[PDB]
Structure 1
């Protein structure tokens, strides 16, 4: 058995491995979103950069979980990674709606793992999620919600104009 493992349930160990798969799935979804908005026939650089950054950020979340798994003496186990849900992502509005759906799913997975940890009396797990994941997720979802509202107010009856303006004047670009 493990020489370091202490107060670390098999249930938590397995749930952490599943959460890693979810975050890597999310990372891959954002990679696809980024390259869609980089297409010459889409060409919204600020949108591309927004999702490319999220791809890296979700990968970092997976990395932290994996590090924690080893710190606790669990065994990182990797599974197949499903492709993203779409090949083409429509408008900025469509994409930001898909992103907030994705983030809510990751948030619920975080809350579910926190509840498991609490049931298992695993305070290191609970604190780890609180300190590195829960607030970052709330902050990101608030940001997406802010963006959705601004995108929606810009649709009006000149959708193209508003999509350009949002990309130019809210999102970070060269």
Structure 2
């Protein structure tokens, strides 16, 4: 590429992976959201929480794709694997699954930053710090807070309703 400068093939490849990870995460949150919209689950606030996260992850992928092009790298898309479950259990089960997923994304970001540091790619490092690293930390904190409140509330049926009504 005529514009490419200080952008390693290793980072370019890792950015394409991370795009796949973010799209997979978006797809997982789509499945989570619609599960809580089932007539036999029916927790609207939980559905909305996860549908909003699907949008956020999709937007993350799009930001990574924009940055890939800005640096002169080439987007390469792969098959998106379906989410790990078809049914997600209770709000607690779902929130546990979500925090596992976010920590997996956070670790991928951290690995990419480490790669960027090893390749002396300060633009990549700043890009990650500006748009992803703090967003992941804040989100993981919020999920941790939710998990604690859900757990405190488990008369499990009543607790799950009250959390959806009064927190989400």
| Superposition TM-score, scaled by structure 2 size | 1.00
Q: Could you tell me how far apart the structure 2 residues matched to 1:49 and 1:123 are?
A: 37
Deviation beyond 2 Å, 4+ runs, structure 1 = none
Match of 1:159 among 135, 156, 168: 156
Q: What aligned pairs does 1:4-153 form with structure 2 within 5 A after superposition?
A: 4-153=3-152
Query: How far does residue 33 in structure 1 lie from its aligned partner after superposition?
Result: 0.1
Query: How far does residue 135 in structure 1 lie from its aligned partner after superposition?
Result: 0.1
Q: What is the aligned residue count?
A: 168
Deviation sequence 1:5-28 (CA, Å, 0-9, x none): 000000000000000000000000
> Once superposed, what is the RMSD of the aligned Cα atoms?
0.2
SS in 2 for 1:27: helix
Q: Could you tell me how far apart the structure 2 residues matched to 1:170 and 1:131 are?
A: 28
Unaligned runs of 5+ in 1: none
Query: How far does residue 58 in structure 1 lie from its aligned partner after superposition?
Result: 0.2
Query: How far does residue 107 in structure 1 lie from its aligned partner after superposition?
Result: 0.2
Deviation sequence 1:46-70 (CA, Å, 0-9, x none): 0000000000000000000000000
Q: Could you tell me how far apart the structure 1 residues matched to 2:140 and 2:40 are?
A: 28
Query: How far does residue 75 in structure 1 lie from its aligned partner after superposition?
Result: 0.1
Q: Could you tell me how far apart the structure 1 residues matched to 2:51 and 2:24 are?
A: 14
Q: Could you tell me how far apart the structure 1 residues matched to 2:142 and 2:57 are?
A: 16
Q: Could you tell me how far apart the structure 1 residues matched to 2:30 and 2:142 are?
A: 19
SS in 2 for 1:22: helix
SS in 2 for 1:19: helix
Alignment correspondent of 2:165: 168
Q: Could you tell me how far apart the structure 1 residues matched to 2:90 and 2:40 are?
A: 12
Deviation sequence 1:106-163 (CA, Å, 0-9, x none): 00000000000000000000000000000000000000000000000000xx000000
